Design a protein around this nucleic acid. Sequence first.
RNA 1: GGCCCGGGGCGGUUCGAUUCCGCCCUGGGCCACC
Length: 437
Amino acid sequence: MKVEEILEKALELVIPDEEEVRKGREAEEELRRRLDELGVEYVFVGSYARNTWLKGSLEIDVFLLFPEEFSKEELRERGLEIGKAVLDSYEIRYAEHPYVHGVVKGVEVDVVPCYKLKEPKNIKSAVDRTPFHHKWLEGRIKGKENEVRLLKGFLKANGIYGAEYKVRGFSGYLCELLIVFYGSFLETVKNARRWTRRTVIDVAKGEVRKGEEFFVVDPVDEKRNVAANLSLDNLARFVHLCREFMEAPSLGFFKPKHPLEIEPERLRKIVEERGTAVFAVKFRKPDIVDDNLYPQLERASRKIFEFLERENFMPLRSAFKASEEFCYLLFECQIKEISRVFRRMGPQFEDERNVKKFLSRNRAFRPFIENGRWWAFEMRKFTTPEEGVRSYASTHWHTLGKNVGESIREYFEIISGEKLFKEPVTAELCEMMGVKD
RNA sequence: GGCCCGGGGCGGUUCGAUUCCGCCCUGGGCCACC
Ligand SMILES: Nc1ncnc2c1ncn2[C@@H]1O[C@H](COP(=O)(O)OP(=O)(O)OP(=O)(O)O)[C@@H](O)[C@H]1O
Ligand SMILES: [Mg+2]
C-alpha cells in the first residue's frame, strides 16, 4: 500500500463511470432545450461545467443572467418562475439568495438567478462571482479534474467537505483553487502538512505568505477569503489527516467512515465508567433552513456551556443534533452534584467603608477573614448541572438564538440516564466522549 | 439567521461593574443558502 498505487485505486471511487457521465450530458441537453424554448439567457457553471463533480454527487448549476438594473425582487420572481417552469419536480428552500432546486431526467439541478456584471468588483447578489469563477477556472483546471476529484473525495469521506454551516469545511471551488495552486492532490496533501492558522494562499499571485488567519484569496476578488467559513478545528483536522495519509497511505481515507451502530447498553457502561454527568436539552426543531439552524444550535450550545463553567460544574464537551422532529443540546460535566455553600470574595480589611457594606448583608453563616480580606459563605440556588440548566434555559431562552430560543421558550426538557440513551443522540455522544472502535 | 466592529438607552447580580449575567434602539462590515 503506497501512495502511488493507492491514488491509482482511488480514482475508481472518485471518477464517474461512462453511464453517470452520459446521464449528466443527457440531462444537460434537456436543460438547454427547455431554456432555449423560453429564450432565456443562461450559463452552465460549477462542477458539471468543468467536469470536476464527484462520482455519485452530480448536481448541475444553471445561472440565469439578469441585467444589473433589475431589483433583487425581480431576480427572485423571474428566476423562480423560470426555474419552476424548467424542472420535473422542484423545491424552493433557501436562507437569503433565491434559487430553485429540482430534477431533470434524474439529475439534481440548481437554477440560480444572478446579475451579469462586468468585473466581480462590487457584487450585487451573493452569487455574482460564480460566473467569473468559471471563466477563470475553465482554462486552468483542464487536465487536472481527476486531481480535483481526489481532493473532494478525500474531504468528503472525512466529513470536512462542504462550506455550509453544517460542515464548516472546504468548498468545491476552494478545492479547485488548491489544485491549480499545487498542481495535484498529492502535492496539496504534502504541503498542507505545514499550513498554520496564519497561512495565506493567493493563487492569483502564486504566493503563500503569513497573515491574520487562514486566508485563500479568490483570484476573482482579492478581498474575498474563499475559506472564510472553514473552521479552525476543521483546518486542523485536514492538516493532521494529511500527515497521517503521507505517513501511512491507505484508500481507507477515501472510504466514508463506518456508520457505527454501538448499542445503548454499551454507552451506559462507558458513562458509568466515566462517572460524569451526561444530559441533553431537547426541544422542537424550528421550521428553518439548515444554514439558519446550525449556527443557532452552536450559539445555544455555547451559551449553556459557558453557564456550566462559570457555575463550576466543570463542563467537558458539548455537542448537538437535529432530527426532523427535535433538536438536542448535549453536555457532559465532571460535577454531578456540588455543595450548597461556596465562598464569595469580599473587600480587604483595610477600608471599613466597603467592609461595612459587605457585612451588612443578611447572611446565613457569618463572613470571616483570610489573608487580609473578608470572605463569606454563600448558598447556591441549585446543586446539579441539570437543575442549573433548567433554570438558565427557562430564563435566558432569548439569548439562545432567534428561532432556537423562541422554541425553547415554548417547550424544552432535560433528558438524562436511561431515558437519554433511547433518543437519536447515541452517535454524537460516543463522538463527544471519544469512545473508540 | 450566525459572527465581527461601533452609537445610545436600561434591568439584574455584586462590597465594588464600562468590565459579570441579560433586555430594548440603532449604524457598519462579513459568512452560510449557488
Ligand atoms: N461558498 C462558496 N464560496 C465560493 N464559491 C461558491 C460557494 N458556493 C458556491 N460557489 C460557486 O458556485 C459554484 C457551484 O457551487 P456548488 O455548491 O454547486 O458546488 P460545486 O462547486 O458545483 O462543486 P460540487 O457540486 O462538486 O460540490 C462553485 O463552483 C463556485 O463557483
Ligand atoms: Mg453542482
